[PDB]
Amino acid sequence: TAGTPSGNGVDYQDDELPVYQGETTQSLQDYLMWQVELTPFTDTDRAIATSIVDAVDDTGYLTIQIEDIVDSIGDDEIGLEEVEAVLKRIQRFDPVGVAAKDLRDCLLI
Amino acid sequence: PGVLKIVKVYLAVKRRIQPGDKMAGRHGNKGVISKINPIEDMPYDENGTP
């Protein structure tokens, strides 16, 4: 072996009985929830926000239909007009354009 | 067998003295800097050398 790499980054939890323990990682959904928790939303608004951010894919686009989201709520007075407003508020988060229904909406936002 | 290319990068920086740094002689006398005084504030002899 003419050229050998230096050791890659690795570690193991020491001085702790449950060895290697763990380490939490921040994903897109976790960051979206963290942002949601720090904006003024009603209880219904919070529920709608959680429901719509649960459906965010890895690429940042919504996989489920808005009408399907309304059906998922399964409660009166939560018609598509309210969920549209909540989703449009959610779209303007740190990854601007996240939770977009299609490419057109993403470019528009 | 797995790797394909390796790149190694070196960075060099200059560390200057500051109040937080530690300084010690070779007689067991150690300590940390408390303040970096200006020249005109330090004591001087009759020749004006601080």
Partner: protein, 308 residues
């Protein structure tokens, strides 16, 4: 009532060493004046010093040049001690170009319009190989005190190319100062003192000029004592409320509810706003829908509110 000192018998031992004398002084004024002048001279005296150097073939301070004995770091350290004088300019550029065998000094620096090298024997490099060439451009700036090369960040406003080497700047020509108080030769007066100030510089500044500058600084500082006396920001907010393109039906309601700006809209909670007359469940959602398009959720809490 009080006698006044006059600068008499100014004498120059050497190019750097010098003596300044003030003959008439009162009982206690000698030490006060001496210490004040020493502090002013050692603290704040203007001068010119090397700011950055750009060598031909090098890229960073931690490199080497084929044909020169020293590293670029030692070249910069030697250049840091260069003593120059500039008239009428603060950003002169001193170009240097020399090839051959032997040490290179400040003597071979190209003769600029108004640039004087007080010490022309300052060795800054050593050339060892016959066919070796060196060529740099030295920028000299005028300053007042010690400025490290890391504190200045404003120089990063414009991109600097790879190859410009930043050196520290001292700007202080004065290196050592002492003073003594001796009995004056004036016999008609009861008891007078005399002040002798000895200074060691790098030859950049005149002794008399330094004394005048220190005295002027002291007087300008003392001028203040002679008369004491003395005994909603984000542009998205504060916009007209008729920028959201709301319905006609909500247009009348906002006027009745005394909402005239975008900012005052965002400070209302859902529970109490619904109690307002004839809002409508579906119409209120459109107000939230439009305000969501701007990123301002309903119910924000500000501190102060100007009329505009």
């Amino acid at each position: 009532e009080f006698l006044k000192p006059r600068l008499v018998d100014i004498e120059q031992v050497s190019s750097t060493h010098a003596k300044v004398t003030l003959e008439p002084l009162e009982r206690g004024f000698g030490h006060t004046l001496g210490n004040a002048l020493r502090r002013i001279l050692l603290s704040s005296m203007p001068g010119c010093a090397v700011t950055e150097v750009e060598i031909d073939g090098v890229l960073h301070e931690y490199s080497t040049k084929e044909g020169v004995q020293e590293d670029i770091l030692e070249i910069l350290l030697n250049l840091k001690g260069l003593a120059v004088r500039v008239q009428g300019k603060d950003e002169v550029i001193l170009t240097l170009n020399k090839s051959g065998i032997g040490p290179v000094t400040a003597a071979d620096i190209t003769h600029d319009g108004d640039v004087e090298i007080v010490k022309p024997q300052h060795v800054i490099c050593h050339l060892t190989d016959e066919n070796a060439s060196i060529s740099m451009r030295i920028k000299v700036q005028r300053g007042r005190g010690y400025v490290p090369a890391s504190t200045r960040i404003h120089s990063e406003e414009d991109e600097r190319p790879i190859g410009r080497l930043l050196v520290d700047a001292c700007y202080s020509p004065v290196e050592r100062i002492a003073y003594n108080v001796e009995a004056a030769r004036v016999e008609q007066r009861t008891d007078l003192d005399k002040l002798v100030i000895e200074m060691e510089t790098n030859g950049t500044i005149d002794p008399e000029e330094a004394i005048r500058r220190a005295a002027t600084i002291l007087a300008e500082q003392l001028e203040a004592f002679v008369d004491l006396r003395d005994v909603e920001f984000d542009p998205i907010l504060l916009r007209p409320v008729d920028d959201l393109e709301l319905t006609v039906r909500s247009a009348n309601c906002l006027k009745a509810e005394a909402i005239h700006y975008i900012g005052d809209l965002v400070q209302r909670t859902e529970v109490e706003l619904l109690k307002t007359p004839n809002l409508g469940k579906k119409s209120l959602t459109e107000i939230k829908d439009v305000l969501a398009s701007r990123g301002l959720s309903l119910g924000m809490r500000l501190e102060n509110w100007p009329p505009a």
